[PDB]
Design a protein around this ligand. Structure first.
Ligand SMILES: Nc1ncnc2c1ncn2[C@@H]1O[C@@H]2COP(=O)(O)O[C@H]2[C@H]1O
Length: 232
């Protein structure tokens, strides 16, 4: 039956097979759960230092590239720049910290981002009770959780040369999940996506982001770049 022209909907290609993502759910180590509750539900005056904490994690992951080269020169062949990108999305109310560091395996997410007790956790909670500044968090080993000063939910997408791409996610409440991520490949590195709380939207503003980077993170050691969406 002759055709001279087809509608879009007719030549619509059949979907790729549905992907299966394996998901697992884990409880946070008891004292990590306690700290996340404390961080979430207490007022702190200097919440901006969350960005100094995640930038530091990124910087540490990038320093690992340079040293891992000494025992695996393969990585010198990568053409990827060692850098950090800050991506506020006013539309979705997210701030995303992206790096091209070494990334995390599945077991690294499960162990490093919640299941293994940290020996400073108790001491830091005591310090906060006794009125320490929240800024001291990173010296107690638990600075990743400062994300929950500003974020109601945090998703971490990551890819390590030794594993497949995974997503960790938690809205606190005592648990997190790790799942395989068959979504947009990142190549190598980690993206931390902060879903900001309703009253913490100043961290999507480019001036505010520039201010806190200048104040707290001016020895990162790698280029940091802020992507600003053009105002329509
Ligand atoms: N951007 C990142 N890249 C690689 N690993 C990270 C990143 N963010 C957090 N982590 C891991 O999570 C850990 C949290 O505690 P640490 O800073 O001691 O060590 C950190 C890393 O192991």
């Amino acid at each position: 039956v002759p055709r001279g022209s087809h509608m879009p909907e007719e030549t619509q290609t059949q979907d790729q097979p549905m992907e299966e993502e394996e998901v697992e759910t884990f409880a946070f180590q008891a004292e990590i759960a306690q700290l996340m509750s404390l961080i979430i539900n207490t007022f702190y005056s200097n919440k901006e230092i969350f960005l100094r904490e995640l930038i530091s994690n990124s910087s540490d992951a990038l320093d690992k590239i340079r040293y891992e080269s000494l025992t695996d020169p393969s990585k010198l062949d990568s053409g990827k720049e060692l850098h950090i990108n800050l991506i506020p999305n006013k539309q979705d109310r997210t701030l995303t910290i992206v790096d091209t560091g070494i990334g995390m395996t599945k077991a690294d997410l499960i162990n490093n981002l919640g299941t293994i007790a940290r020996s400073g956790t108790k001491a830091f909670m005591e310090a906060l009770q006794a009125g320490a500044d929240i800024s001291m968090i990173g010296q107690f080993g638990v600075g990743f959780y400062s994300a929950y000063l500003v974020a109601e939910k945090v998703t971490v997408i990551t890819k390590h040369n030794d594993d497949e791409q995974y997503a960790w996610e938690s809205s606190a409440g005592g648990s997190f999940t790790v799942r395989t991520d068959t979504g947009e490949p990142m190549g190598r590195g980690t993206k931390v996506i902060l879903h900001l709380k309703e009253d913490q939207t100043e961290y999507l503003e480019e001036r505010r982001i520039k201010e806190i980077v200048k104040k707290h993170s001016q020895f990162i050691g790698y280029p940091i770049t802020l992507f600003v969406e053009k105002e329509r």
